[PDB]
């Protein structure tokens, strides 16, 4: 599950104003990548309702990957 992975994640994950995190909202789509520098990778959110599409960073398998 490297170069590029997409996750399915079922979590509401959405603190502080602003800030970079997968703003997961309880069965949503994560598509991430490998990129572990030390053991965080960086993702974008792909929202099923209007289009939130922003970018965080997780500690490695956050999600269901189904590549």
Same mark, same amino acid.
């Given at each position: 599950?490297?170069?590029?992975? @997409?996750?399915?994640? !079922?979590?509401?994950? *959405?603190?502080?104003?602003?800030? $970079?995190?997968?703003?997961?909202?309880?069965?949503?789509?994560? $598509?991430?990548?490998? @990129?572990? =520098?030390?053991?965080?990778?960086?993702? *974008?959110?792909?929202?099923?309702? !209007?289009?939130?599409?922003?970018?965080?960073?997780? =500690?490695?398998?956050?999600?269901?990957?189904?590549?």
């Amino acid at each position: 599950g490297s170069h590029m992975l @997409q996750v399915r994640a !079922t979590k509401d994950y *959405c603190n502080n104003y602003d800030l $970079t995190s997968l703003n997961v909202k309880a069965g949503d789509i994560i $598509t991430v990548l490998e @990129q572990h =520098p030390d053991g965080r990778w960086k993702g *974008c959110i792909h929202d099923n309702r !209007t289009g939130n599409d922003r970018v965080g960073y997780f =500690p490695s398998s956050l999600g269901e990957a189904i590549v």
